Amino acid sequence: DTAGCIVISDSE
Amino acid sequence: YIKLKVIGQDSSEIHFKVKMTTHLKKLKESYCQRQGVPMNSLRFLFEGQRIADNHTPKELGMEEEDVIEVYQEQTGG
């Protein structure tokens, strides 16, 4: 099947 | 971390984990880069409303396992 994992780091 | 449910129209399970400090501004471009498309080519729809570049994960009411939709715009990017 399809599994996607994305992690994003954003700071004010 | 806040794990949102990004289910594509093609029935794809994408787990996008964000934070509270992060701006939704970068969230939009990151998704575009992930799909390999220009910015503003896709529109995010949350509870009928569209997510703006100046929106925050704090407002509206986003929680864990939150379902959100994203469709292609008419502008083309």
The span from the CA of B6 to the CA of B64, in Å, is: 12
B13 to chain A, any CB pair closer than 8 A? The answer is: yes
The two structure tokens encoding residue B77: 């990017």
Experimental method: NMR
Across the interface, which of A3, A7, A8 has its CB nearest the CB of B26? Answer: A8
Backbone phi, then psi, for B32, in 5-degree steps?
-65, -45
The span from the CA of B18 to the CA of B58, in Å, is: 11
Q: DSSP assignment, residue B69?
A: E
Only one residue has tokens 């083309």, namely B76
B6 to chain A, any CB pair closer than 8 A? The answer is: yes
The span from the CA of B37 to the CA of B41, in Å, is: 7
